[PDB]
JSON list of C-alpha atoms in Angstrom, two decimals:
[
{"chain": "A", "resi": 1, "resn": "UNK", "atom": "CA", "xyz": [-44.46, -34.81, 23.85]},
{"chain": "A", "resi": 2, "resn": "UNK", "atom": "CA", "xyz": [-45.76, -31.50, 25.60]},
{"chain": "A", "resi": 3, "resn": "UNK", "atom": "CA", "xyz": [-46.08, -28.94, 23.03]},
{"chain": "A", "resi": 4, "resn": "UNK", "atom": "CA", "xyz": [-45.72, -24.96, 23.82]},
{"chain": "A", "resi": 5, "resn": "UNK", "atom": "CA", "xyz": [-42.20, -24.65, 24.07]},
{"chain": "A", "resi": 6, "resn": "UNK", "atom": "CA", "xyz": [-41.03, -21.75, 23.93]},
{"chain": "A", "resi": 7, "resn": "UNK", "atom": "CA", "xyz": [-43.57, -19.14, 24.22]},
{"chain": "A", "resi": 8, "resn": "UNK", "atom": "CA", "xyz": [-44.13, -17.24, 21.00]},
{"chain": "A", "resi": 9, "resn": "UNK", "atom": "CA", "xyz": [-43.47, -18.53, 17.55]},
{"chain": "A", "resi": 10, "resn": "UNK", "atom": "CA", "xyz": [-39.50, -19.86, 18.38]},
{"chain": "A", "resi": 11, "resn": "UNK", "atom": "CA", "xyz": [-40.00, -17.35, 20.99]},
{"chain": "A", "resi": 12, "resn": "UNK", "atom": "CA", "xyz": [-40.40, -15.08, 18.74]},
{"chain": "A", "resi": 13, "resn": "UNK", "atom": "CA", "xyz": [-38.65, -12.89, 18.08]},
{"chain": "A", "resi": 14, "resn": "UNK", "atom": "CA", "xyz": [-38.11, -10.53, 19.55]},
{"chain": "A", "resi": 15, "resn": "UNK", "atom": "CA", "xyz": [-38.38, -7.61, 17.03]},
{"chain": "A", "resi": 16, "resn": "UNK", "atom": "CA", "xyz": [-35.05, -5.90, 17.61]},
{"chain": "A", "resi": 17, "resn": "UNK", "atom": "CA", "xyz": [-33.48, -9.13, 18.50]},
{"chain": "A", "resi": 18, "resn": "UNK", "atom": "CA", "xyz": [-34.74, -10.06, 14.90]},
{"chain": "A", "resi": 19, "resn": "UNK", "atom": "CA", "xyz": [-32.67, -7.15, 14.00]},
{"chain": "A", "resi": 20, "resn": "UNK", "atom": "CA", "xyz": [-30.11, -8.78, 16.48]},
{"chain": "A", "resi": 21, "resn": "UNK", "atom": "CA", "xyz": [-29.15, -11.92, 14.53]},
{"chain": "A", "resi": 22, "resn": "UNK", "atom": "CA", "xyz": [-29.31, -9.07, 11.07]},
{"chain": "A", "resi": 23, "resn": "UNK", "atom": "CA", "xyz": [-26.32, -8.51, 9.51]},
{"chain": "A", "resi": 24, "resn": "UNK", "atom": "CA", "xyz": [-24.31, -9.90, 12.08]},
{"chain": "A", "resi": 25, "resn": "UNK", "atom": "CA", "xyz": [-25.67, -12.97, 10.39]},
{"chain": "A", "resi": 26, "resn": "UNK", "atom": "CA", "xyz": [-25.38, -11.53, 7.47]},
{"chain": "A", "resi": 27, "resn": "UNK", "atom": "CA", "xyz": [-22.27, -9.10, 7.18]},
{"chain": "A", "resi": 28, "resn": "UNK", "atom": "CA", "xyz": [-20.02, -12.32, 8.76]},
{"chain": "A", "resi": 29, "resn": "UNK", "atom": "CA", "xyz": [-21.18, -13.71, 4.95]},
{"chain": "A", "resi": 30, "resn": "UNK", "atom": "CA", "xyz": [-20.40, -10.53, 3.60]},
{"chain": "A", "resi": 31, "resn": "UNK", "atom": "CA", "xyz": [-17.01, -11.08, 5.06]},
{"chain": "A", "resi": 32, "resn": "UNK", "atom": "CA", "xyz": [-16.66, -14.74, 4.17]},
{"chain": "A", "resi": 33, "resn": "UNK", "atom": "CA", "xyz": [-16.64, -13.09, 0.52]},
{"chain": "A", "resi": 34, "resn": "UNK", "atom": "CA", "xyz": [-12.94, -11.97, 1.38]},
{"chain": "A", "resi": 35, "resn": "UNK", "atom": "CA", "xyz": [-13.06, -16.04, 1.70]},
{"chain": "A", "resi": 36, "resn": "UNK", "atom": "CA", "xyz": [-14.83, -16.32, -1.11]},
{"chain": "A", "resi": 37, "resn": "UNK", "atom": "CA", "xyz": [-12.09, -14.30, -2.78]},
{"chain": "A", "resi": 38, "resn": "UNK", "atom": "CA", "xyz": [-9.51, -17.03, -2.28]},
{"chain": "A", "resi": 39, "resn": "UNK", "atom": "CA", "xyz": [-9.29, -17.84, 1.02]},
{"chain": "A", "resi": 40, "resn": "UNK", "atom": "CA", "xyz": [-6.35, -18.97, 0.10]},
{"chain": "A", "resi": 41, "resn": "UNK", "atom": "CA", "xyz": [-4.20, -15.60, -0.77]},
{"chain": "A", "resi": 42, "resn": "UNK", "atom": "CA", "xyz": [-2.01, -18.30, -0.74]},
{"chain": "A", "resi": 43, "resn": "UNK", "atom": "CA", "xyz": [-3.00, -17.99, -5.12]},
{"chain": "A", "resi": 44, "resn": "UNK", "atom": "CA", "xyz": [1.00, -20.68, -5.57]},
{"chain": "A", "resi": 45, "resn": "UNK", "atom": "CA", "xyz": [1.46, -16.92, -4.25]},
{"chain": "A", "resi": 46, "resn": "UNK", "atom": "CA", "xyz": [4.90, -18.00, -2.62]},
{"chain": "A", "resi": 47, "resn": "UNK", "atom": "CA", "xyz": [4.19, -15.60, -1.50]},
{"chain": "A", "resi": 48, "resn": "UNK", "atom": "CA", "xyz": [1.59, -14.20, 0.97]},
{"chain": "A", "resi": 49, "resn": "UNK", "atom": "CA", "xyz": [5.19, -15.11, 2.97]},
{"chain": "A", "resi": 50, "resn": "UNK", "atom": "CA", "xyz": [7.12, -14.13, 4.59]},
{"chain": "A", "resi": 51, "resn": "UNK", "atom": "CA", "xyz": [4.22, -13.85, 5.98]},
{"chain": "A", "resi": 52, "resn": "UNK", "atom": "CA", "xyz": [2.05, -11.78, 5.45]},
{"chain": "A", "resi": 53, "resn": "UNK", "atom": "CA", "xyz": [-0.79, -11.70, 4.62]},
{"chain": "A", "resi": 54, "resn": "UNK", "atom": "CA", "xyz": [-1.40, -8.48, 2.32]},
{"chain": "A", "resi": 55, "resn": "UNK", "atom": "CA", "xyz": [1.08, -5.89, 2.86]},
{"chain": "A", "resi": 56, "resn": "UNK", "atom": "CA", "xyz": [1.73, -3.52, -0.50]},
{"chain": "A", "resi": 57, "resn": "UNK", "atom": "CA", "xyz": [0.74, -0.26, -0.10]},
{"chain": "A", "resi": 58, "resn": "UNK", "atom": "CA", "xyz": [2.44, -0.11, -2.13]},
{"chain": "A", "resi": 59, "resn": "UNK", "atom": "CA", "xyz": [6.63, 0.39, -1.98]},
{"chain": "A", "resi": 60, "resn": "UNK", "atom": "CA", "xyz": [7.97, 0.21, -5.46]},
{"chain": "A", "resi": 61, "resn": "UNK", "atom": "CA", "xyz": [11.62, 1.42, -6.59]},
{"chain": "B", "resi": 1, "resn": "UNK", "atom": "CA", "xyz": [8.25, -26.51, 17.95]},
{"chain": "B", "resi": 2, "resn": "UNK", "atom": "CA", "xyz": [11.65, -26.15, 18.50]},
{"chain": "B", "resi": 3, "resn": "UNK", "atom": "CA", "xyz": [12.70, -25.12, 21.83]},
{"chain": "B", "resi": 4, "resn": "UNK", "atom": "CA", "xyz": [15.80, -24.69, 19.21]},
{"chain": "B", "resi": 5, "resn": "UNK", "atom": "CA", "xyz": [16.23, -21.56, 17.45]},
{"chain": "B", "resi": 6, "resn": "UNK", "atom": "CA", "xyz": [12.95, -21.35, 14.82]},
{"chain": "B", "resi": 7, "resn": "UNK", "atom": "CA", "xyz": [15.07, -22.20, 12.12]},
{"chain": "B", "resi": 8, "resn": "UNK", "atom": "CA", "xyz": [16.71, -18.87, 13.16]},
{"chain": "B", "resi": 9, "resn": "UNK", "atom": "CA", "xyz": [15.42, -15.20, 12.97]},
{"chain": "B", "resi": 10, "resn": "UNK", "atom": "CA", "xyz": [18.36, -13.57, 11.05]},
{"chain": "B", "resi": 11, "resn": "UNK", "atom": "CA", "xyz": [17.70, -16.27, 8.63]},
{"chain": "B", "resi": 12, "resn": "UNK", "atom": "CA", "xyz": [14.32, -16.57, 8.63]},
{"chain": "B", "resi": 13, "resn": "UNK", "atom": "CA", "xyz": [13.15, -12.89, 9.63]},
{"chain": "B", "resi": 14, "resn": "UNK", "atom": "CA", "xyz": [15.88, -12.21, 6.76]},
{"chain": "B", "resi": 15, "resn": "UNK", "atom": "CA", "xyz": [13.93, -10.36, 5.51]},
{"chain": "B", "resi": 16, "resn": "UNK", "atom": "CA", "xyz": [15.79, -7.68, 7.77]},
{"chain": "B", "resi": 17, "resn": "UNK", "atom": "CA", "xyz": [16.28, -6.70, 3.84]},
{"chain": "B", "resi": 18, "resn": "UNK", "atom": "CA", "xyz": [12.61, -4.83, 3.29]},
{"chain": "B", "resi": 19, "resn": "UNK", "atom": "CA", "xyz": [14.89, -2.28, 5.21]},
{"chain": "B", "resi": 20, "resn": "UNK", "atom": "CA", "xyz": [18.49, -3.14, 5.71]},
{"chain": "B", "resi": 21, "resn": "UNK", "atom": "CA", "xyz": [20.83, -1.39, 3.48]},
{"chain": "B", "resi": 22, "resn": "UNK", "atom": "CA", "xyz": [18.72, -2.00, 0.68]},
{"chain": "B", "resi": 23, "resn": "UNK", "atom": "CA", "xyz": [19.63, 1.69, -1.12]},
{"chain": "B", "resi": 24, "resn": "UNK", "atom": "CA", "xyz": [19.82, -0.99, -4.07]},
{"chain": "B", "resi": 25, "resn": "UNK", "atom": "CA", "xyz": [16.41, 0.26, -4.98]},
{"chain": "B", "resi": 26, "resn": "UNK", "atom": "CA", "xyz": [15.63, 3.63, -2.78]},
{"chain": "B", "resi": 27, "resn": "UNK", "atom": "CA", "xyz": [18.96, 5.18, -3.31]},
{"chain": "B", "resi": 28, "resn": "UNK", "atom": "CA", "xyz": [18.68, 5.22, -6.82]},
{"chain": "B", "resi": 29, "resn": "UNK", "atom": "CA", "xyz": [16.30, 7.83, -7.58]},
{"chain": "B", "resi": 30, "resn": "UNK", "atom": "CA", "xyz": [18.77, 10.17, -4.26]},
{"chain": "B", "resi": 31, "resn": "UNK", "atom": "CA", "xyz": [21.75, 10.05, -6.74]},
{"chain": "B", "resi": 32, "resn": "UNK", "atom": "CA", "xyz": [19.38, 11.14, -9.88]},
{"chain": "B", "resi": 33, "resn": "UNK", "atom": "CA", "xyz": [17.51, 13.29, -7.28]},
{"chain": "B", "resi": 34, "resn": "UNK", "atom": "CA", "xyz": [20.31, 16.26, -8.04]},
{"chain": "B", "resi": 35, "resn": "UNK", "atom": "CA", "xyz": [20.35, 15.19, -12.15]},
{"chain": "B", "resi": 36, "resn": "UNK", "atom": "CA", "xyz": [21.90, 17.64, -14.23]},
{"chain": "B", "resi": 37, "resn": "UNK", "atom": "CA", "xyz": [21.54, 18.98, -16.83]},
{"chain": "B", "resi": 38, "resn": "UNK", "atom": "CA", "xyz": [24.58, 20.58, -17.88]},
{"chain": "B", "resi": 39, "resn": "UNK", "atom": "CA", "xyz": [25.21, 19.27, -15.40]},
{"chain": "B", "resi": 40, "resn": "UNK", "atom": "CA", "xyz": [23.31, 21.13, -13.62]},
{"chain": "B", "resi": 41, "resn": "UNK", "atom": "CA", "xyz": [20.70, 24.24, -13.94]},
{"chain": "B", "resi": 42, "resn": "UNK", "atom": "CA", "xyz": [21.71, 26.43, -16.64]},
{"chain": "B", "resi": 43, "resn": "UNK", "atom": "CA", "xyz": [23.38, 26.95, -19.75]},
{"chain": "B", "resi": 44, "resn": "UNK", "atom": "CA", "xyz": [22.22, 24.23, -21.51]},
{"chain": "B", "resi": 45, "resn": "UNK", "atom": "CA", "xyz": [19.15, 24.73, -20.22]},
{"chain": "B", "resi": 46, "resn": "UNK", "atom": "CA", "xyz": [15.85, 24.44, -19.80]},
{"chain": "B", "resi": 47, "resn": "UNK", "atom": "CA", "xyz": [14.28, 23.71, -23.75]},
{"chain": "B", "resi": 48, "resn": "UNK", "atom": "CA", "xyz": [14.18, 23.80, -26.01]},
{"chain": "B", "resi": 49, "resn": "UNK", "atom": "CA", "xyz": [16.92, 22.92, -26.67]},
{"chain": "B", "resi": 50, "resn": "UNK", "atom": "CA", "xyz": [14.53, 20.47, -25.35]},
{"chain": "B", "resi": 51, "resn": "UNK", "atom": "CA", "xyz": [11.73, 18.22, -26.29]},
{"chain": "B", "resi": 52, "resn": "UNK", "atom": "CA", "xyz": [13.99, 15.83, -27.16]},
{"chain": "B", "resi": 53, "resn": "UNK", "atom": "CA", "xyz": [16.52, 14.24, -24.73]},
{"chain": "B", "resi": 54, "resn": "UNK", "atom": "CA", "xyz": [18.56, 14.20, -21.56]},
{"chain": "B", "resi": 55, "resn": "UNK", "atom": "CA", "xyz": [16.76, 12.57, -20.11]},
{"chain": "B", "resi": 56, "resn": "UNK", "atom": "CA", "xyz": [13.75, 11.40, -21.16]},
{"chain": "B", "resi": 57, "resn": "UNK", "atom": "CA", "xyz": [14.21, 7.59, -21.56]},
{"chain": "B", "resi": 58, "resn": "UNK", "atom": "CA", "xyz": [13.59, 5.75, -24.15]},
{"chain": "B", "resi": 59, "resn": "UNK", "atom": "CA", "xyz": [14.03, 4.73, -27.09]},
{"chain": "B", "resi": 60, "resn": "UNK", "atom": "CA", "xyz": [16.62, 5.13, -28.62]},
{"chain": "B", "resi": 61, "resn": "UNK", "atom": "CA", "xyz": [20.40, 5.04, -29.40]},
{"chain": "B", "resi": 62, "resn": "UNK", "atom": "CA", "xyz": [21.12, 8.25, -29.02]},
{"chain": "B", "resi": 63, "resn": "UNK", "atom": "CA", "xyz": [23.41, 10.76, -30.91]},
{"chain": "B", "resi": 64, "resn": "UNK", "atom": "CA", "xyz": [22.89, 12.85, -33.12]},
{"chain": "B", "resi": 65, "resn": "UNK", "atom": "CA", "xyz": [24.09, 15.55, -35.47]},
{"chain": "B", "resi": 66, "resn": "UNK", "atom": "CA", "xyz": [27.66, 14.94, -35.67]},
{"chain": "B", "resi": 67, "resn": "UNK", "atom": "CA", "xyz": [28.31, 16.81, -32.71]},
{"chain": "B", "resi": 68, "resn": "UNK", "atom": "CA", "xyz": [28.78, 19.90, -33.76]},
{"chain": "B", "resi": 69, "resn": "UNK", "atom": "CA", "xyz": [29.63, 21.42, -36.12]},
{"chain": "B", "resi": 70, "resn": "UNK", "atom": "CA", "xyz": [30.56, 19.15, -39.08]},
{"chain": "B", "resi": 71, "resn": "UNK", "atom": "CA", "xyz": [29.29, 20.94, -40.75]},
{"chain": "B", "resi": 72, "resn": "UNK", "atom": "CA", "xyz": [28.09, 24.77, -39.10]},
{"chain": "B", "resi": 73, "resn": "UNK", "atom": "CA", "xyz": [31.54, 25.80, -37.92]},
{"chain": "B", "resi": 74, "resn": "UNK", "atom": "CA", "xyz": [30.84, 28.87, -40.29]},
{"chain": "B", "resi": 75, "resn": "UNK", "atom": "CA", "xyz": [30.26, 26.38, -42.50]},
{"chain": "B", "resi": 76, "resn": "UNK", "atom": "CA", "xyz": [32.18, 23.67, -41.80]},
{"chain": "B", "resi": 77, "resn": "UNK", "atom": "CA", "xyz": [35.52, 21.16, -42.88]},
{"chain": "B", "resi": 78, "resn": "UNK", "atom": "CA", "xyz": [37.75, 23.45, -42.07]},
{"chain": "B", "resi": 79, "resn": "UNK", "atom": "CA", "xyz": [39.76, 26.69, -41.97]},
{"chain": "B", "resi": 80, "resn": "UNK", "atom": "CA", "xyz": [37.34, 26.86, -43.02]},
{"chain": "B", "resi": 81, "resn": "UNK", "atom": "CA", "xyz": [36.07, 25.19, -46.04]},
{"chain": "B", "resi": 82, "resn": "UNK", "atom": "CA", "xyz": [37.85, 25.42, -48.51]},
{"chain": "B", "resi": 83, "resn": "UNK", "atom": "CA", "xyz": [35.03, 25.40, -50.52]},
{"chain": "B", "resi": 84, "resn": "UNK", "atom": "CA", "xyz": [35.44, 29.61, -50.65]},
{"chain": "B", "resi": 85, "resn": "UNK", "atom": "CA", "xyz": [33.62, 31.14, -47.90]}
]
């Protein structure tokens, strides 16, 4: 019932903790792009084993 | 799971072969890594001589020119023509 809670506007924010949630928000999706980019690496890859995952650098001969 | 072996290391980890003795790709550029040409330095000889072959690649058979010189012995044949000199 009530009404207030919390005190601000969802407390807000504050204004570095606005800053706080960010990129950290964001960058985490920035990083679920290497997800994006098959989050599988597993592509039938055979593969990305024995594991693995990445690793050329890359060897050759 | 397995308690067991894990389907065994020097079976599974076998890939103890990105390292092994596996000169079946490295040590083949350490036995051209001294190649020739002449074999070696010298005589026979830097180009060219050169522009053109051993090594390069390619390609591409390769001979050619007789081998020599049939003819360019002064000309050729021979002792030595004769075909007057």
């Amino acid at each position: 019932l009530w009404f207030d809670p919390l005190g601000w506007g969802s407390a807000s924010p504050q204004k570095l903790k606005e800053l706080r949630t960010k990129e950290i928000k964001n960058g985490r999706l920035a990083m679920l792009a290497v997800m994006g980019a098959w989050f599988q690496h597993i592509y039938t890859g055979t593969g990305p084993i024995d594991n693995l995952f990445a690793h050329l650098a890359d060897p050759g001969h | 799971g397995v308690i067991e072996e894990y389907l065994e290391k020097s079976k599974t980890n076998k890939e103890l072969n990105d390292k092994k003795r596996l000169a079946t790709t490295g040590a083949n550029f350490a036995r051209a890594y001294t190649v020739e040409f002449g074999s070696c330095k010298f005589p026979e000889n830097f180009t060219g001589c050169q522009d053109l072959a051993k090594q390069k690649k390619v390609p591409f058979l390769s001979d050619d020119l007789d081998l020599e010189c049939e003819g360019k012995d002064k000309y050729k044949c021979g002792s030595n023509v004769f075909w007057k000199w």
